[PDB]
Design an enzyme around this catalytic site. Structure first.
Site, PDB file in Angstrom:
ATOM      1  N   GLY A  19       0.782  -1.328   0.082  1.00 30.69           N
ATOM      2  CA  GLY A  19       0.027  -0.001   0.072  1.00 30.69           C
ATOM      3  C   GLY A  19       0.924   1.309  -0.118  1.00 30.69           C
ATOM      4  O   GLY A  19       1.505   1.505   0.824  1.00 30.69           O
ATOM      5  N   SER A  20       0.826   2.093  -1.270  1.00 35.35           N
ATOM      6  CA  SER A  20       1.560   3.014  -1.300  1.00 35.35           C
ATOM      7  C   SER A  20       0.970   4.660  -0.620  1.00 35.35           C
ATOM      8  O   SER A  20      -0.452   4.691  -0.715  1.00 35.35           O
ATOM      9  CB  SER A  20       1.757   3.637  -2.635  1.00 35.35           C
ATOM     10  N   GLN A  22       1.699   8.780  -0.148  1.00 39.10           N
ATOM     11  CA  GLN A  22       1.829   9.798  -0.905  1.00 39.10           C
ATOM     12  C   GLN A  22       3.429  10.207  -1.508  1.00 39.10           C
ATOM     13  O   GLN A  22       3.706  10.272  -2.492  1.00 39.10           O
ATOM     14  CB  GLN A  22       1.212  11.134  -0.306  1.00 39.10           C
ATOM     15  N   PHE A  23       4.311  10.430  -0.112  1.00 37.26           N
ATOM     16  CA  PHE A  23       5.577  10.525  -0.609  1.00 37.26           C
ATOM     17  C   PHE A  23       6.412   9.240  -0.484  1.00 37.26           C
ATOM     18  O   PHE A  23       7.689   9.355  -0.330  1.00 37.26           O
ATOM     19  CB  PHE A  23       6.205  11.625   0.278  1.00 37.26           C
ATOM     20  N   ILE A  25       6.287   4.809  -0.979  1.00 34.69           N
ATOM     21  CA  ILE A  25       5.504   3.496  -1.317  1.00 34.69           C
ATOM     22  C   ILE A  25       5.921   2.343  -0.704  1.00 34.69           C
ATOM     23  O   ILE A  25       7.420   1.892  -0.545  1.00 34.69           O
ATOM     24  CB  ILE A  25       5.905   3.261  -3.040  1.00 34.69           C
ATOM     25  N   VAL A  26       5.128   1.639  -0.063  1.00 37.86           N
ATOM     26  CA  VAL A  26       5.497   0.330   0.681  1.00 37.86           C
ATOM     27  C   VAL A  26       5.333  -1.011   0.115  1.00 37.86           C
ATOM     28  O   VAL A  26       4.165  -1.113  -0.602  1.00 37.86           O
ATOM     29  CB  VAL A  26       4.475   0.336   2.035  1.00 37.86           C
ATOM     30  N   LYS A  41       9.469  -0.045   3.557  1.00 36.44           N
ATOM     31  CA  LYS A  41       8.829   1.071   3.054  1.00 36.44           C
ATOM     32  C   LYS A  41       9.905   2.048   2.586  1.00 36.44           C
ATOM     33  O   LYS A  41      10.575   2.740   3.059  1.00 36.44           O
ATOM     34  CB  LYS A  41       8.490   1.867   4.527  1.00 36.44           C
ATOM     35  N   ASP A 138      -0.949  11.268  14.716  1.00 35.59           N
ATOM     36  CA  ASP A 138      -1.811  10.533  13.603  1.00 35.59           C
ATOM     37  C   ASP A 138      -2.377   9.222  14.177  1.00 35.59           C
ATOM     38  O   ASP A 138      -1.781   8.074  14.325  1.00 35.59           O
ATOM     39  CB  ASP A 138      -1.021  10.145  12.395  1.00 35.59           C
ATOM     40  N   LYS A 140      -5.829   7.205  13.818  1.00 32.73           N
ATOM     41  CA  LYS A 140      -6.968   6.959  13.050  1.00 32.73           C
ATOM     42  C   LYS A 140      -7.223   5.686  12.865  1.00 32.73           C
ATOM     43  O   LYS A 140      -6.230   4.802  13.141  1.00 32.73           O
ATOM     44  CB  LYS A 140      -7.104   7.784  11.639  1.00 32.73           C
ATOM     45  N   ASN A 143      -4.699   3.486  11.008  1.00 30.06           N
ATOM     46  CA  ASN A 143      -3.562   3.797  11.597  1.00 30.06           C
ATOM     47  C   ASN A 143      -3.638   2.237  12.712  1.00 30.06           C
ATOM     48  O   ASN A 143      -2.689   1.934  13.066  1.00 30.06           O
ATOM     49  CB  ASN A 143      -2.863   4.590  12.204  1.00 30.06           C
ATOM     50  N   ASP A 160       2.587   3.577  11.179  1.00 34.58           N
ATOM     51  CA  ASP A 160       2.896   5.080  10.355  1.00 34.58           C
ATOM     52  C   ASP A 160       3.093   6.028  11.375  1.00 34.58           C
ATOM     53  O   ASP A 160       2.500   6.815  11.654  1.00 34.58           O
ATOM     54  CB  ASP A 160       1.560   5.346   9.329  1.00 34.58           C
ATOM     55  N   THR A 179      -5.354  14.557  10.038  1.00 27.87           N
ATOM     56  CA  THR A 179      -6.745  14.301   9.473  1.00 27.87           C
ATOM     57  C   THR A 179      -7.821  15.124  10.211  1.00 27.87           C
ATOM     58  O   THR A 179      -7.985  15.388  11.334  1.00 27.87           O
ATOM     59  CB  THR A 179      -7.229  12.934   9.435  1.00 27.87           C
TER      60      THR A 179
END
Length: 303
Positions: A19-20, A22-23, A25-26, A41, A138, A140, A143, A160, A179
């Site tokens: 799952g990527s 934004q800045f 890619i995993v 990652k 973060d 959420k 996460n 994350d 968020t």
């Protein structure tokens, strides 16, 4: 500087892109020597100045300085750190068991006692962090991950740590953060921040976990933000008809305008709804349920 100057392809065979962001890619990797399933990652390093692509050279070694310090079962654990020039790839503990909320969507009944099992898991990992003076800002439902899906009661891992920061005593730390939903009012205003911020999130997560509807999201971002600064949250009888007065109180004491009066993580664990004292409380907690009708309908729309 403690970093490795070896090519990451010579040690690990890269595979599926899990799952990527934004800045970064995993990608699901694997070690050549041991054959052990691991995650990798690949974080894109920044160019020089006002580049649109890449994360800071300073801010990348901050996320690492946290993860090296974090050895706990209920949070993720960093295996190895490689860098070359283009990217800094972090070998992390592979997690492939979906979101917590994804597993809870499956459940057909799920009580309020059964629910507290998981909340406690989160709080555990969170307490470990707060002890080390670390704040995962973060927090959420995306996460809050799971190790394996098959187990009757599954393991929770927290992921994350890009938006994590080591909090000093005298040194102040202001910033505008992640968020819209799960952010403290201290974050919305350009006000000083601490561990208190995390606890707010927890309350928001709990609210949605018990009902499905978010306590502060309106229609527009503008509204959502004004709601958080105004601290407006209604326990509607449409969603909270069969929820306990101790569950409402747990959330109510987490979502406080101030920072002094907002619960610490120790206080959250020493709260009746989480850890009761007698059967009189434990009976209500047992005979209460989570509104899965709404929780399913609301969580479905996030995909």
């Amino acid at each position: 500087e403690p970093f490795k100057q070896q090519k990451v392809e010579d040690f690990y065979d890269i595979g599926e892109e899990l799952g990527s962001g934004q800045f970064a890619i995993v990608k699901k990797c694997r070690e050549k020597s041991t054959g052990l399933e691991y995650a990798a990652k690949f974080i894109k390093k920044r160019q020089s100045r006002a580049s649109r692509r890449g994360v800071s050279r300073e801010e990348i070694e901050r996320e690492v300085s946290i993860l090296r310090q974090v050895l706990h079962h209920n949070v993720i654990t960093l295996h190895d750190v490689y860098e070359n020039r283009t990217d800094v790839v972090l070998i992390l503990e592979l997690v492939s068991g979906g979101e917590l909320f994804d597993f809870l969507a499956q459940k057909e009944s799920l009580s309020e006692e059964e629910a507290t099992s998981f909340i406690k898991q989160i709080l555990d990992g969170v307490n470990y962090l707060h002890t080390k003076k670390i704040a995962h800002f973060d927090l959420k439902p995306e996460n809050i991950m799971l190790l394996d899906k098959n187990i009757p009661i599954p393991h929770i891992k927290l992921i994350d740590f890009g938006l994590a920061h080591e909090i000093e005593d005298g040194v102040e730390f202001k910033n505008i953060f992640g968020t819209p939903e799960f952010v403290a009012p201290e974050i919305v205003n350009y006000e000083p921040l601490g561990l208190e911020a995390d606890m707010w999130s927890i309350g928001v997560i709990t609210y949605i976990l018990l009902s499905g509807a978010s306590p502060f999201l309106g229609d527009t971002k503008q509204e959502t933000l004004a709601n958080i600064t105004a601290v407006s949250y209604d326990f509607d009888e449409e969603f909270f008809s069969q929820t306990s007065e101790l569950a409402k109180d747990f959330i109510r004491k987490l979502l406080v305008k101030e920072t002094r009066k907002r619960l610490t993580i120790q206080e959250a664990l020493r709260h009746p709804w989480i850890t009761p004292v007698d059967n009189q409380q434990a009976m209500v907690r047992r005979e209460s349920v989570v509104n899965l009708e709404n929780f399913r309908k609301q969580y479905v729309r996030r995909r």
